[PDB]
Amino acid sequence: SHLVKCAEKEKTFCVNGGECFMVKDLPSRYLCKCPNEFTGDRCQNYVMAS
């Protein structure tokens, strides 16, 4: 994988149960893996349909 888990400092970065990840590339790019109920750059928004 191109991704690694974030430090404990960056735990609170992703909200609403989002899992933080960094990218190994040479700055380092951060991302959130969201639970199905949430979205946004930091899982800050609720997913919605219909």
């Binding site: 959130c32 893996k33 969201c34 199905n36 946004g40 928004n45 997913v47």
Partner: protein, 550 residues
């Protein structure tokens, strides 16, 4: 003509990879113009992306990262405007589109029509199995300097006819150069190499002929098929008189268009459809038309909403900005309450909001954009803090919605007491398990357009509400109520004293006598003497309409 919003997630995605794919399909299928960003991230090798062939234009940026599929089918994409850029620098970013193991990854880009990138640069790097992309003359596609326009073995050569610049192996894969190949007299793009073949200066992408009606895309505005720099203004200077004259062929600027009329919910300033009046001017209605006119003396208290001016950066109301709303009567923009607003955002050192502080909103009469309630203090059962809110303009929409109340367990009634108008957008009231009065409201009475829908799902069953006695007061009309009591009606069955519906006015008995202004009970002038023995104290307003003087 089939527009969509697109995401703002960047590299963030859903943990469920099928849910991530299903979301991509949900957001972008049958969309021609992405009015924002086209983000394609973390998509598996097997996946079908044929639906992306629908995309012709992207307003913001194109992010294609961390995917494993062989080919990118954006075969109809012509323009990336780059109004918003990835990392505030790239209009197109294609990177890490392979699995580190080394099995599969992106091999070919189907961007044979991508001939314009209006603003921003190109970042195509770290794509282990991508071929031909190295041959692309990006300098031709990017319209303006962007000190970042670069592409970073065992790849097939371009076809002979391609002139060493192609997207794939065949003779039908050649890169169409539309700028560098032009006659020295073309200032824009071209469809050939002679002076006959130049595009109009207003064409974006390319053209099929010399006229401003022959463009593939417009550089600025579209005025009835003609690509224009600006719309016909209301005033026109006459050079011989040295005076401005009325232009009767004037049109209004709305988005990227010259329109015969502004939407009803929008304000007219100059010959343009705007969302807000300048701080110096005030909104006024003249024959149903909202306009910006200079302030009498002092301008009304209009406040920046979430994502506007002083609060451009903001995503939600929080403890750091709740105080920027003291004494606001109008909100120029939106009001959004996210989970991280109500319950605090620890990472950015923002404490959870003080529920008492939500009372700042009791002064708010109008919200020009939208109202988005995704979070609310648990001890609070209703939105009575919005007891004075009359209008939601819907001049800005969140996925076509102007009102959102979702996932709120603590709410049992709404209590939007003063609410009378939702000018644009749809309503989305879902998953508020204990909400009870919503099902009685004839939301239709609040709408302006007939295109306005209502999405009410998974709140407390209407049958369950009724059986638990959560019904409207008898003095409410068939239009419904916001919650319990006579003060909470949408309209009265009989009379009304202020905000409360009553059976009759104080005509013959009561501390303060009243006359009936047709269903509205108005108190008699203090100078009118309290007439006893079945006599009326007054027969209208003011001291002139008294029965006897005190």
């Amino acid at each position: 003509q089939s527009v969509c919003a697109g995401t703002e997630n960047k590299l963030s995605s859903l943990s469920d990879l099928e849910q991530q794919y299903r979301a991509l399909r949900k957001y972008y299928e049958n969309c021609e113009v992405v009015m924002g960003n086209l983000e394609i991230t973390s998509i598996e090798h097997n996946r079908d992306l044929s639906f992306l062939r629908s995309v012709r234009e992207v307003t913001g940026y194109v992010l294609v990262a961390l995917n494993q599929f062989r080919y990118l089918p954006l075969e109809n994409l012509r323009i990336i405007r780059g109004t918003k850029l990835y990392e505030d620098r790239y209009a197109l970013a294609i990177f890490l589109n392979y699995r580190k193991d080394g099995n599969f990854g992106l091999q070919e880009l189907g961007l044979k029509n991508l001939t314009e990138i209006l603003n921003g640069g190109v970042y195509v790097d770290q794509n282990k199995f991508l071929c031909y992309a190295d041959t692309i003359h990006w300098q031709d596609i990017v319209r303006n300097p962007s000190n970042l326009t670069l592409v970073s073995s065992g790849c097939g050569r371009c076809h002979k006819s391609c002139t060493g610049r192609c997207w794939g192996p065949t003779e039908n894969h050649c890169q169409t150069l539309t700028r560098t190949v032009c006659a020295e007299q073309c200032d824009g793009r071209c469809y050939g190499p002679y002076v006959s073949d130049c595009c109009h200066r207003e064409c974006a992408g390319g053209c099929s002929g010399p006229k401003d009606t022959d463009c593939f895309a417009c550089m600025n505005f579209n005025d009835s098929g003609a690509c224009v720099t600006q719309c016909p203004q209301t005033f026109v200077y006459n050079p011989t008189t040295f005076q401005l004259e009325h232009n009767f062929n004037a049109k209004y600027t709305y988005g990227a268009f010259c329109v015969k009329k502004c939407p009803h919910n929008f304000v007219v300033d100059s010959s343009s459809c705007v969302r807000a009046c300048p701080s110096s001017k005030m909104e006024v209605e003249e024959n149903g038309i909202k306009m910006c006119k200079p302030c009498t003396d002092i301008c009304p208290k209009a406040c920046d909403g979430i994502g506007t001016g002083s609060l451009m950066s903001a995503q939600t109301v929080d403890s750091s900005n709740i105080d920027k709303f003291i004494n606001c009567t109008k909100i120029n923009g939106n009001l959004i309450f996210l989970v991280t607003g109500i319950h605090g955002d620890p990472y950015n050192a923002i404490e959870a909001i003080d529920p008492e502080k939500l009372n700042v909103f009791r002064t708010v009469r109008e919200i020009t954009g939208f109202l988005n309630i995704q979070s609310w203090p648990p001890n609070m059962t209703d939105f009575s803090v919005f007891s004075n809110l009359v209008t939601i303009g819907g001049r800005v929409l969140y996925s076509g919605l102007s009102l959102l109340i979702l996932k709120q367990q603590g709410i049992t009634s709404l209590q939007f007491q003063s609410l009378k108008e939702i000018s644009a957008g749809n309503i989305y009231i879902t998953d508020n398990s204990n909400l009870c009065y919503y099902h009685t409201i004839n939301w239709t009475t609040l709408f302006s357009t007939i295109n306005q829908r209502i999405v009410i799902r998974d709140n407390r069953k209407a049958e369950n509400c009724t059986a638990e006695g959560m019904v409207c007061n008898h003095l409410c009309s068939s239009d419904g109520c916001w919650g319990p009591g006579p003060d909470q009606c949408l309209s009265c069955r009989r009379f009304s004293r202020g905000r409360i519906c009553i059976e009759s006015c104080n005509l013959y008995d009561g501390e303060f006598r009243e006359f009936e202004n047709d269903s509205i009970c108005v108190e008699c002038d203090p100078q009118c003497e309290k007439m006893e023995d079945g006599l009326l104290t007054c027969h209208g307003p003011g001291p002139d309409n008294c029965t006897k003087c005190s």
